Amino acid sequence: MTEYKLVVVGACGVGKSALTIQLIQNHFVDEYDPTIEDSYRKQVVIDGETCLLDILDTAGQEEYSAMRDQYMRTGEGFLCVFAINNTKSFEDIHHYREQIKRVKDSEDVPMVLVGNKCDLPSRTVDTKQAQDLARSYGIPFIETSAKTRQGVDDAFYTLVREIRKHKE
Ligand SMILES: *CCC(=O)N1CCN(c2nc(NCCC(=O)N(C)C)nc3cc(-c4cc(O)cc5ccccc45)c(Cl)cc23)CC1
Ligand SMILES: Nc1nc2c(ncn2[C@@H]2O[C@H](COP(=O)(O)OP(=O)(O)O)[C@@H](O)[C@H]2O)c(=O)[nH]1
Ligand SMILES: [Mg+2]
């Protein structure tokens, strides 16, 4: 079966680890060590086709370094996560998109924009703001809550669909 290398990126504390652990283990982690970067494998059925997901949950801060850049080029799709109560993390999406474009030779890289923590009432990044940014990039936007699990599988599966569309 096909294996998809997915890379979860975004600012510190947006929910990268919580999203990933909800996908893999189906529980919510409150204090997953912010410095720990690990990969997880999971077999899933998407649109009736079984595949293997190979998911990197990023945590390191280093950039513009040959080794990390070479590794990130191997990512086939990127889950670009911000938190809807963290304006800075939304603004950082530009930086993450630029890093993906910098390291990937391809001009069209599978990406999904994820606005996480949608269970919270204090929302400083509007749905429309994020939808407009996703429309500018031409990529899907998904609102998620790792806490309640809303949209978690949909975000990852949407990214796989974006890779399948790119490879075809
Ligand atoms: C809690 C700690 C945590 O989760 N993280 C992960 C994200 N981190 C991170 N920080 C930065 N800082 C640069 C300052 C800046 O201007 N902004 C907007 C944050 N840079 C990161 C870069 C990358 C990254 C690096 C390379 O080399 C390639 C590449 C390709 C595609 C996507 C990202 C990258 C990563 Cl993975 C995380 C970065 C802070 C700690
Ligand atoms: N309310 C809420 N809290 C979340 C959500 N996702 C993550 N968190 C919390 O925000 C903090 C940072 O999450 P984490 O996944 O460790 O962030 P990372 O640095 O991006 O890996 C932790 O306390 C999580 O429990 C969410 O969807 N809703
Ligand atoms: Mg983490």
Structural domains of the chain ordered from first start: 1-168 (3.40.50.300)
List the resolution, Å: 1.6
- Protein residue with least CA distance to atom 28, ligand 1: 69
Using a 6 Å cutoff on CB, does residue 96 contact ligand 1?
A: yes
Q: Which residues lie closer than 8 Å to 66 by C-beta, 6 or more apart?
A: none
Give, for 39, the enclosing helix (H) or strand (E): strand 38-46
Ligand 3 geometric centre to CA of 25 (Å): 15
- What span, in angstroms and rounded, lies between the C-alpha atoms of 112 and 108? 12
CB of 69 sitting under 6 A from ligand 1: yes
Way the structure was solved: X-ray
CB–CB of 156/79 below 8 Å?
Answer: yes
| CA 78 vs CA 2, 8, 44: distances in Å | 17, 6, 18
The Cβ of residue 35 has, within 10 Å, a number of other Cβ atoms equal to 9
